[model samples]
Target: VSLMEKLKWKIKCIENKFLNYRLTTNETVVAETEYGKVKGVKRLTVYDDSYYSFEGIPYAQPPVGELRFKAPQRPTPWDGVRDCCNHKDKSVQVDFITGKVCGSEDCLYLSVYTNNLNPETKRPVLVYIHGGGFIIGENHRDMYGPDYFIKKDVVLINIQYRLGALGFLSLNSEDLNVPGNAGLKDQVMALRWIKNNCANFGGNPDNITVFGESAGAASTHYMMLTEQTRGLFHRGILMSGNAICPWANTQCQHRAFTLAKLAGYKGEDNDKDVLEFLMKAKPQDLIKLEEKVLTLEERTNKVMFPFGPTVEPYQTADCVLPKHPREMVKTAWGNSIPTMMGNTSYEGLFFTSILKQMPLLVKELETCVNFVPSELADAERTAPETLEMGAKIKKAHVTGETPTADNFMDLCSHFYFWFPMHRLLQLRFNHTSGTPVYLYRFDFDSEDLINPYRIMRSGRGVKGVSHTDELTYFFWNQLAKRMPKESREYKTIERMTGIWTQFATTGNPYSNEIEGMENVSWDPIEKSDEVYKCLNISDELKMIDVPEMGKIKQWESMFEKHRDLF
Candidate 1:
């Protein structure tokens, strides 16, 4: 049968089974939630014994018109059966290609997938948040479909939150009534919705595991710091990006300033009006205004995607404002919750390539550092003496007989990605010991036809497991070039899926001993500062004590130079 036919057959079979065997598709399978009674449709798929798919579940009231820049309010429920099959319209998103128009503000809904609607089972809940750097993405992304996990008897929830300025811009006292971080508020509301209604969909509200990659991971990190999100989810799986001090709340305010100037609003005065005007503007006009506001280079460097979560001093009604993530780590933030966090081996590969493409010499780098008013850069290079000292320290670490230009770039990479992440990890490890913290470095490289950057080799002709390369294993379907279903890489997929699912089912990633997979033991990241279990294609997993693991320590010293500023 063709793929589409197979999909249809699978859907039909699942729906029929659910209708007959399970009371899933009954005429009145209504769930009276705190928000309201939501009617859900049930079906069984090839992957699950029975499944219920609910869409357009509102976590927050629509943030349109005057409500645009404000924190999301609890969604009020309607008496009748509201349509729950279609996805909520998405918020405005930045167009990556033409840098044109995309998305809208009517996007605060969520989607859920569950194996059984029976509340008795109370299966573990896995909430999946999509990632696009808080700018672009929606729950409809095919790669994020929870079919694979729902079949494993886990309840899966994929939510859509606001994006860009509509979701992230902050306002001062003039707009005190309407604060910032609307997107984050939406996420918190989604969790609250799940907590209140998950049992109706066969989900264990108490056993929810929030997971995300890249920007989603960053959101997860922020949630860890926010008091409002505390106790909403029991566990978290942060991939690629760790929620640390990558961006400060003040930086968000600066971004808002730049956006305001771009929108032709002179000052922070009338901030709410500015937000309202931007919200009311045509999507194309807004897109053009966004483009005129910041160049690609500036956006990439500053990461000024209109909307982002900012630090709020006051907590909303149901919200809890935890300390900053860095501070939270010191106070054992979410120490009770088992956490699994990791970064791809080539985390800096993409960013490094972008930096390399820029026509920048060391002098231009210095000039940019001098000219720019970034606290981040200032914190890095506060004293000229320290800069020279850092250069010397980096020079001392060179391995070979002679240092190459690539070595200098390596130093730059250390300064940028590796060091910051390492410091964040250490901070987290220091603060939390209540639950086991598992860390891994995804080192597997798919150098086959599917690897898009196969041509863009490093100086060594080895990408050495660049950033986001490991996502291919976790998110195979989302890849631009899909790996053949029958290929060996698919087997690796099975292994990874097993590991992740096992972790969700039980806090432990390993269950029974597979015949040949005894060596694949995941170790907790503790005092040893040990690198994670290097996962390659083979079943055998080994611990690699990478060189420059101490480089992280050196980088920490660099951060120390700018600690007060950060």
Candidate 2:
């Protein structure tokens, strides 16, 4: 075949794989935005041939110089066609183990992905906010590529924002210059940009669905909590995290003072001067200072998130979240949008997987001393009643004499992820008037390809899925490339993506795209307590209520009777 003929074959293969069949013989991947015309690149991925990537699309002005520690400013239009082919840098982040720091002050850019782009195609938008404990993560195409979503006739957008103390540190002042939730405001600003310009890229500005996992999921929850977020997005999906999680409430005047003192700004002794000094200090230097203040346990385990969403004491009229997030989630049920919330069966497995280094903590798990996050203890001063409640929790999950990592994972999973997700769903389901609520529990074991369960322990194979295991289905990563197809795993991946894609389009999760899922209907959580049927996602997709629901109910009573602090 001639060179041109071979290239034509490649293009035809891509055209066959795509759901968005509209294209031109020109095949140039450039688009016009309200800001200016942006030059993009054609990209292909493991999911199949796809592309048209507009990268480093600046959604907000650089939060640098005098704008430091302040809410983001809207992006100004460029004079000419900006080359948006390369990804912008990540937000400022520090790594302790290697003594390294990465990212830039001018890092509030978003990436858009699509195979078909025209004013006529109004594809559903899935705007993803990357999660890293609200401290360390990047919104990059390689990390969160749109390979899967774009195939489902959706326009995928991944956005970057300020992180750590720079984004979330609370100064508690009404000054528009210094409101808390600077990071969250960055998100809202990104939405505003999307609202204005997403349609030019063939996205439905009115039908945007914001979805995320971990801190990003917490962020989605935060968006729901804020009265300021009424029409920002029409739908939300929260996975494996909640704003009501204790760790989400980390930054405060006290934490600000501590982090500042560690960073050598104690002379001023107030949040303003300290924040001013921090602005002057190198952002990487401030992130390193976080390591100096954290205790060994906090550093070792998932302790305080160190920097996360905080309640703004001086929350003015424009505050994204004026009240405590928990307070907002409780009262804002009337303001609920259509939602889907879920957690893995063993979400704590990720934290406890690293327990090989802390064998002593595992052996003394019954005492419940080292298990508690030192940062929370530092803030509230570990209540003795809390540990007693921990003992009760330990008794409930642990039955054998040998306190293996398996059972311990169960105990921590309940307190950290399982019960919290259940109760949050229960409250939202009961309180919210009519919007549909969908619940899921991911229990699929990944021992087939990666063996996420064997991250620490080799023998005596343990419980169900670990946190982020289901991510393999929706996302394409290096690990996902190892598997071929036609296994139980591949079926799970197909069905899972179909469910999410269908959910994003309609309020329901049923689709004819997935084969052999006749009995796998995903029902909404309605009035009946016992009748609440969830999609028990596993090797074989089951729709019955898990027996662990009894244990979930059991822990709810124990937590409420004694340790209802959460």
Candidate 3:
């Protein structure tokens, strides 16, 4: 069958899989793309007006069957207006148990939420990529509503791509069939689709900003640095993830080997045989490789997951990423355009919430204290060196605090998420002389936002300003009604929405990047910037050095500088 025929079969698979998937409304509003016309439901703005939302719009033919594990091809255009009414309603799936179908291999879809489609609405465009650590996520308009940013005069396009093994598995060899970074390339295709068609939706194709949280943020970074991105978008906003972090890219020859073997694929120990077998196997057989192949060790690193972006083999055909990000950032950012990136003050709290669930982890948690830091310091370090560095990390965060979950939490966060980002920023600043690089710390802890621990493990205390807590202030979240409009946290959302949209409209995050005194214009951090001087978000928004610099500098001294020893 041709690609479109396979897509036609998978269209049945998609309908069956998402059969019960809620459609917002049968009633439709019309829009046009370069290839075809589309119809979507009108959604309410938080301010009460409605914006047309096109959900589940296909950007590529289904990447199923023979197409699985390959780079994306151009989406087969369609005739007639597509009724984009299918939307996943998690809130509706209450008491939902096993055997649930959320999304599918035919899931290379994109959603657009906009108030303007007139040729005159030359508004800034915000292309958002959802984060699931390259594993599981979809673009749902309800998750990222158009209430806030649409008011800020920008078109918001939330996108979808392949995830986990289907998206990121690699064998460290070249092949047209099993080309790696399929997930990342899926992103590239979505941007190209936007570049060509966003203007039809009343967006300025010239002023597109790619923004995301966690892996999504890293995707924005990759889109900026990769060879494939031909000015498809303008600026980038990275919330809590970047390519330089150890977790973003995977060295996954082992994962490929394991997946092929587990899928009952008859293949030689080479890229060619692996591709032939993987291509022949059912996607169900392949996705199930996760059931047993995934282990705690692969899932528990500072980078979090094992399967993801990788340094492509030398001279690839479609080399989305040509080199290791450590090397790529220097060269890419120098010639790159305007981009912004930053992290939460306590990123490791996400881990803390997870660790709390696995009580057996305390046995392993004792080892995390020693291993994660030592690995950063020098993976090949002897017992003496590891003990010494590990002790310093523990001692620094401990202060007067005892040896408990709290102590391990901050130190692990510093080594794993915070300082590595500091190192990444330093690398970018040192090279890029032209484009401005903005750094921010979303340290805000909102009382109104749902405390994750309460839902998962209620007895434990709050993980201080945990990762992604700042998301509430920027995007319209489910908890907005709970927040009193007069509260500081609520008003803080207004400032952050303004600040972030300001960055989307222009490269600068705020009128000022730093806020020491009242009204000084905040300059971008220099290449040698060690001072925190980043915007600190909360109800009390200001610019200052991140308070954890002592710990930040400690981990900074040990990374890649010591990778040679590993």
**Per-prediction TM-score to the true structure, in the order listed:** 0.79, 0.86, 0.84
lDDT of 3 by residue, 1-566 (tens): 13543454446445433422332335477788876988877656445555668877778878887777778888778899887766532211111112233456778888887766664659888888977678755565434555676666678888888887778767766544454788898898898999988888888889998889878888888887876786677788878888776678867766776788888876578877777787776665666555456555554443356568887765555678878887777677423677677888777776665565665544433433443542443443445655555565555666553456666667666655676677677677656756777777777775555422223222234646776677666666433443566777656666777777788787776654322224635567676565767777665666777687877776654443475422
Indicate whether candidate 2 or candidate 3 has the larger lDDT.
2
lDDT of 1 by residue, 1-566 (tens): 13553454456446543433443344335665676677667754333345677777888888877677677887776786766754566667654433447667678889887656774667888887877677777775233544445546777888888776666666565335545677787888888888888887777777888888767887777766676677887788877665553532323544555666666665454655566556665554554555455556555344445445565545556433334555665664566677777666555554444445554433333323322223344344556654544454454344565544444455544543455567666666666655777765565666552322222222125555665455455542222243465666655655666667677767776645422357666566665646633333343455455444666665455445566633
Best by TM-score: 2
C-alpha lDDT of residue 523 in model 2: 72
> Candidate 2: which stretches are off by over 4 Å?
1-28, 95-99, 119-121, 173-177, 266-268, 295-303, 333-335, 369-388, 447-464, 478-485, 530-532, 559-566
**What does the lDDT read for residue 320 in candidate 1?**
33
How does each model score on lDDT?
A: 0.60, 0.69, 0.67
List runs of model 1 lying over 4 Å from the truth.
Answer: 1-32, 37-51, 245-250, 254-257, 265-276, 291-307, 313-323, 352-357, 361-382, 389-417, 447-464, 475-486, 513-516, 528-539, 546-548, 559-566
**Candidate 3 C-alpha RMSD relative to the actual structure:** 6.9
Model 3 TM-score on a 0 to 1 scale: 0.84
Clashes (N, CA, C under 3 Å) per candidate: 13, 0, 4
Candidate 3's C-alpha lDDT? 0.67
- lDDT tens per residue, model 2, 154-266: 78889888988888877764453576778988888887888788888898888888888878888888777777667777778888888866566664555676787787775
